[PDB]
Design a protein around this ligand. Sequence first.
Ligand SMILES: CC(=O)N[C@@H]1[C@@H](O)[C@H](O)[C@@H](CO)S[C@@H]1OP(=O)(O)OP(=O)(O)OC[C@H]1O[C@@H](n2ccc(=O)[nH]c2=O)[C@H](O)[C@@H]1O
Lengths: 702, 11
Amino acid sequence: SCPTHADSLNNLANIKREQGNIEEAVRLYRKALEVFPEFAAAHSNLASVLQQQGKLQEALMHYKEAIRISPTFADAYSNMGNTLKEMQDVQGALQCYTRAIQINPAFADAHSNLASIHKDSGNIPEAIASYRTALKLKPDFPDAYCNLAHCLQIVCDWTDYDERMKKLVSIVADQLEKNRLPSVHPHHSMLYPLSHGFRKAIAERHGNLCLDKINVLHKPPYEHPKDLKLSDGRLRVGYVSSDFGNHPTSHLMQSIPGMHNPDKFEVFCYALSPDDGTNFRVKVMAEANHFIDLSQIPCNGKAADRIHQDGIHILVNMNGYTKGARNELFALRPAPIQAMWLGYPGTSGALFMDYIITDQETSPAEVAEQYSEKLAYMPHTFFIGDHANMFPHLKKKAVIDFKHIYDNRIVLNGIDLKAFLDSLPDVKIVKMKCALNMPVIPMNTIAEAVIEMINRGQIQITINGFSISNGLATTQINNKAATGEEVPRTIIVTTRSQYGLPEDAIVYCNFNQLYKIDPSTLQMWANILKRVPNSVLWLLRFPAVGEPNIQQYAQNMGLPQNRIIFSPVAPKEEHVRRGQLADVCLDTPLCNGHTTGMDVLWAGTPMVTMPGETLASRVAASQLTCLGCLELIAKNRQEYEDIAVKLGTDLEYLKKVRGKVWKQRISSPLFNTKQYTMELERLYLQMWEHYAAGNKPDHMIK
Amino acid sequence: GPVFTSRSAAG
Ligand SMILES: CC(=O)N[C@@H]1[C@@H](O)[C@H](O)[C@@H](CO)S[C@@H]1OP(=O)(O)OP(=O)(O)OC[C@H]1O[C@@H](n2ccc(=O)[nH]c2=O)[C@H](O)[C@@H]1O
């Protein structure tokens, strides 16, 4: 019955949590609650560690209790909220946060938590509002400050940018030393000027967050195979992803499982997400030797066992710290070898991950410092894309003449393009020198009927019985094709006039999310635009609220509205296809276009880059050197501007480079998934031979 | 239509 006894028990548990010894802390709290059952603070503390243990089920019940005892406990409401969120019950969580703020208007944390819900839903201005509220209520609040910082980044509010940055670094630096969990998310750490030392250290900590959740399960280490004997001479590779579906990851690697060689490899795909019923999911299920739906084995314990029973040699993590990740699986070390691949563009910083598949250009030897894993190099680039298979209609184009002869003002693509062109009277064939060429339809009645459709905004027309489609309406003609799930079965016209682009101008584009732009990147582009008098920059409303903001910072650098053009975001296929309309693509040096990189390159649109120091800023370079276009890679800001300007001012040079990209996307290794798969296989075998000979993981540079 | 981006984890 004694609260004085119970009280000191609580103090003693609070001490075990300081020393990190969690399992003892729990025992004490439980006694404290057995001595005095109506003890608010204990229920609350016990709850907040059970939450840490991933025992959300029970943790919630104790929070409820604390609230029942002591109903003015705004702090418990807020934390109960966090618990509901993690249980996928957003509504319930939200009700808590609001309920708390009502009880204590002046309580900072609940406002911050509320803003975080808003962020997850994509409600950014609403998120900003609430973060700002929280920081007014409590001006030293790292979590809120950093989250705010990321929103501002997301919409390109660069108010006080340099201060902001200095203060972030300063906050992390403190939290790292003070030994707490840093407020900056690892996946974001790449956007700010932290030391590589810091980036790694942040990742470390999130790695450890896993270990806590698995010590609760008390599992013995697993027994890994030492030979390929039970697996019948075949090496067993498991791909683990929450993204077998309509997601970038699948748009890159969906062909790979199918292309593995069955004599030497047995392929297991472990889905962490439910079936969205898209073809991406269908294809992988149909081609992998074994498809396993782990989205229905939510206990990380049984899931790990399952992998271990399947007898996997190499387990590949395609998530890192993205949404859907379940790194607890990897932390349980069910495979002898575990590598990061493709999905997450940074180090995991964690002990349980052995290798990271990358390349010479992305991760040269000197910067080994910044990864916790050991480097495993692919021969060219570690990047890959399914464009060859997804969008073969863009393997060839044709143009309509209206005037000079331009490769990108009115464009036609289609599987049956050749057949249609032969139905036409007067088709001139422009040679592309140094087997290749681009047909040109002259301005007869037919061409006019096509512009007619475009200008009037109609869906489609018929010409000599061929089906001709408006590029903007693909989605209504055939939704599966618009998404990339099918190859289109009609001919598709794509024009600059559709997007309100000047017919007679140099078009620089960037199709990435706006968060990747910073004030230097923009300055740099302003520079280019000024020096290339009759040109525009083409950007996306990604998200839309970022547009007014960029327009502002552009006006401050002396650019009329006219000079930057924003299009809405488009379905995958349209997005890829309309890159054909640009002249050059300027790549964000803070954090490169990754998928976006492949997407412009597939369109045959040269892309200029300046490789930084983080992996995320070095990818476009890597893609380009693999393509074989070393003259599009700048060493510094000055040089980048020069390359861009030369391309805009020298129409002969442009045509040469454009033409060189158009050829090499086929001939280089870059979009060749078969060859890619094979190199990946060679690499796997090296990793295994090494482990089989009884060695610990170490760098692999051929 | 809508987009499918890489989204970050929860912290
Ligand atoms: C920095 C970062 O996180 N990089 C990740 C890589 O490390 C991962 O390996 C990539 C694969 O998992 S995801 C990611 O690569 P990114 O290039 O940053 O792409 P991001 O996540 O912004 O969205 C791109 C999508 O929007 C599509 N997109 C774009 C415009 C449009 O109009 N329509 C459209 O579908 C694009 O075609 C794509 O379909």
